[PDB]
Amino acid sequence: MKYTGSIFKRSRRLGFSLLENNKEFSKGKKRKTIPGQHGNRFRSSTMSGYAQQLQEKQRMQYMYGITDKQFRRLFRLVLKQRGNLAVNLFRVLESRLDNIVYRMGFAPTRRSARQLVNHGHVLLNDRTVDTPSIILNPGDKVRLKAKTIKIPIVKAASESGVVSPFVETNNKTFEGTYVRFPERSELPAGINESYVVEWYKRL
Template structure:
């Protein structure tokens, strides 16, 4: 499946939002849309454009294609509860996001690669689908074969360097190389700077 493989910093500048930790420092030095005439392409701040940019920002933040994101939104609209919060819950429960949020990868893009390359088991069975949605009681574990790789041998240091904040809905152990889902993602623990209501309004047009 096709992916947007453009540099994450370039994507971040386009959205005006750091899509990965390494983008923070660079964005502090540079501003505006990337490209020689980037700032000249900034349009008026209409409500539609604001909604569109928020949708694009969140879609790129979690690394989804347009069709994937739209499909997830449709599912969220059919579920009981606040559509925007349900959408964020679905995004947070993706296997690749869980690996990233546990600090087992430095970016969601890297986490997606780790999952898609089959380095994890889910409840004892090999998993290679980054989009699979985890629920309370599920357990991700680095496969025995992968534990011998240099990357996972250094997992303790990788997690320590990530500076991740422990989340109430998961329990991770870098030494045991496990991540357990203990509950549902909370809205206040989602990525800062997201206005999910703008996305709901965009798809409600």
């Protein structure tokens, strides 16, 4: 399946906010213990390299909404080119169309943004899209199709949106652009991408 059941449990065990900072921000007296009946005390007793490496892997791919095989394909494709490993891999993961829609701030959550992308609400470079795995390059222009703006969920995000310097947008015209590659310190750093990148000896 490409969709997950519960999202706060993921942040519970992974210990990483799937949201910006509100994943465990005392929502209904939010907690940080591991889920299930056995959250009492499993603090750190079998912390192995393999365990924590799986931890960073799931952290890396849960906040992106990906699954295993396509992530493996992404890793292979980014390994095909020349450069540094982790930062190029993160660039490819930030070249996802739905992730760029989220960074546009046009939708409150990546799930809503992904549904809007799939349902044809998103038009890219004067071309409609239906594949959330398109690879965006620097200097690529985006719009909101100039259609289906009459959505209560898209508005309050559209006016209230964090314009990161690596992608610029125009609120009223609903136009965006992928100008420069996001930097390591620009995005959340609760993910140690190194343990992920050398967790793959697959090739």
